[PDB]
């Protein structure tokens, strides 16, 4: 579930190096670059291509 419709949703994103899920919210979507801005619980931020990420809602 990607695209502009994901904005506003709380998701957990898989970081392979830590073998961990980290919780955040999708704050925006860049249509041209197909990028989501994820703001994490712990203050981290990532600009992500979610289609090549392991991640899940909830």
């Amino acid at each position: 579930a990607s695209g502009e419709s994901l904005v506003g949703s709380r998701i957990k994103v898989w970081w392979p190096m830590d073998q961990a899920y980290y919780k955040g919210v999708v704050e925006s979507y860049d249509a041209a670059k197909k990028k989501h801005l994820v703001i994490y619980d712990d203050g981290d931020q990532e600009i992500l291509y979610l289609k090549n990420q392991k991640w899940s809602p909830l």
Binding site: W15, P16, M17, D18, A20, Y22, D42, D44
Partner: peptide, 5 residues
């Protein structure tokens, strides 16, 4: 790298 630690 993409790690918290």
């Amino acid at each position: 790298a993409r790690t918290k630690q």
